[PDB]
Amino acid sequence: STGSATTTPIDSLDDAYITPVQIGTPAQTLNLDFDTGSSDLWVFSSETTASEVDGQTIYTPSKSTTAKLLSGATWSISYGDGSSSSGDVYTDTVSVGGLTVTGQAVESAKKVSSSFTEDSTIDGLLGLAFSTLNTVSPTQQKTFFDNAKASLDSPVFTADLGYHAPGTYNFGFIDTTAYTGSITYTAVSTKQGFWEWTSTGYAVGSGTFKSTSIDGIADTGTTLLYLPATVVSAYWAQVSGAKSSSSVGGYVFPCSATLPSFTFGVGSARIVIPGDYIDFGPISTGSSSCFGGIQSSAGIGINIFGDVALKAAFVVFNGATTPTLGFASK
Numbered sequence: 001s002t003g004s005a006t007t008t009p010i011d012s013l014d015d016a017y018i019t020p021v022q023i024g025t026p027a028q029t030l031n032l033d034f035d036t037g038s039s040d041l042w043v044f045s046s047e048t049t050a051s052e053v054d055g056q057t058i059y060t061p062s063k064s065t066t067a068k069l070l071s072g073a074t075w076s077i078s079y080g081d082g083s084s085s086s087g088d089v090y091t092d093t094v095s096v097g098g099l100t101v102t103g104q105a106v107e108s109a110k111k112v113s114s115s116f117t118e119d120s121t122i123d124g125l126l127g128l129a130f131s132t133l134n135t136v137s138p139t140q141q142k143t144f145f146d147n148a149k150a151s152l153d154s155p156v157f158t159a160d161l162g163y164h165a166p167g168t169y170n171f172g173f174i175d176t177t178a179y180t181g182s183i184t185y186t187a188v189s190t191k192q193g194f195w196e197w198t199s200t201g202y203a204v205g206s207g208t209f210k211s212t213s214i215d216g217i218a219d220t221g222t223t224l225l226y227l228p229a230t231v232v233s234a235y236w237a238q239v240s241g242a243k244s245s246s247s248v249g250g251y252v253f254p255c256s257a258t259l260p261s262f263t264f265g266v267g268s269a270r271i272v273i274p275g276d277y278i279d280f281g282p283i284s285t286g287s288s289s290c291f292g293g294i295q296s297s298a299g300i301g302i303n304i305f306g307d308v309a310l311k312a313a314f315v316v317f318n319g320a321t322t323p324t325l326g327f328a329s330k
């Protein structure tokens with residue numbers, strides 16, 4: 001089998017991407033944030049505290065003839081931005097872009113943090129990291145991808161995120177028309193449960209390439225690119241007036257600037273992030289200060305190749321027995 005679904009930026013800055021997902025019988029379609037940095041599929045639901053729901057579409061298991069309570073199972077998660085959610089668990093039929101999984105754990109939120117409530121466009125998350133990170137207790141559950149894997153033509157999924165435009169998540173096949181040149185594959189460590197890999201270095205604009213190992217994760221659920229402070233300082237030093245602001249919470253730059261590109265290494269190959277991709281707009285409406293798309297990972301504990309990096313590439317998440325990651329230009 002295969003699946004293919006369009007993913008769409010939630011706003012004009014690509015702050016996140018949502019993908020329609022069919023849950024239950026008859027189908028209930030929710031727009032979920034596909035997140036290769038976590039491993040829970042959770043949704044706003046008929047069980048979510050009323051004051052914490054504001055415009056989201058909810059999953060109502062009582063209206064699904066294929067829903068079953070996963071008795072005694074609960075879940076609780078907190079993400080890197082400090083947001084969180086928790087609740088109980090059902091199993092149900094879940095389809096993405098034509099690909100159907102029966103008995104998928106669908107985690108129903110009873111509580112969500114304010115950042116989720118405040119975002120009316122995201123109805124939940126669909127985790128695509130390794131199932132060892134799944135938070136369901138006392139019986140850990142498999143991701144949608146993990147459940148689908150044996151039935152897929154090939155045990156892979158691909159992320160083709162657009163810049164200020166829709167993109168595509170494919171399951172079970174590689175669309176050779178979706179990228180240019182060849183795909184460079186690189187080793188993955190699953191030791192922390194992430195799609196963790198090592199970049200071979202970087203360049204700023206037209207500068208010389210710096211060969212240096214940068215360990216990080218490929219995370220579709222993170223908006224920006226988080227790299228070591230040395231790397232991030234070297235980038236913003238090429239932008240007149242750019243500075244790190246503790247009050248704002250990262251590097252800002254004059255909205256009048258033309259941003260240089262940023263290149264990262266994948267083996268001997270190079271992925272170029274155009275300068276415009278690194279612009280996340282006025283820090284507040286009308287401000288002449290703009291927020292940068294490359295930020296320091298120093299206070300995170302891990303480097304994160306988020307959407308700013310990934311949208312510059314066609315990315316293959318290879319879930320074979322020995323997992324790997326592939327990057328192509330497009």
Ligand SMILES: CNC(=O)[C@@H](C1CCCCC1)N1CCC[C@H]1C(=O)O
Nearest residue numbers: 061062063064065066067068069090
């Ligand atoms: C109409 N859907 C349901 O009644 C749900 C049930 C699931 C748990 C509570 C919400 C509704 N199932 C489908 C088969 C019968 C029943 C069950 O699991 O016992």
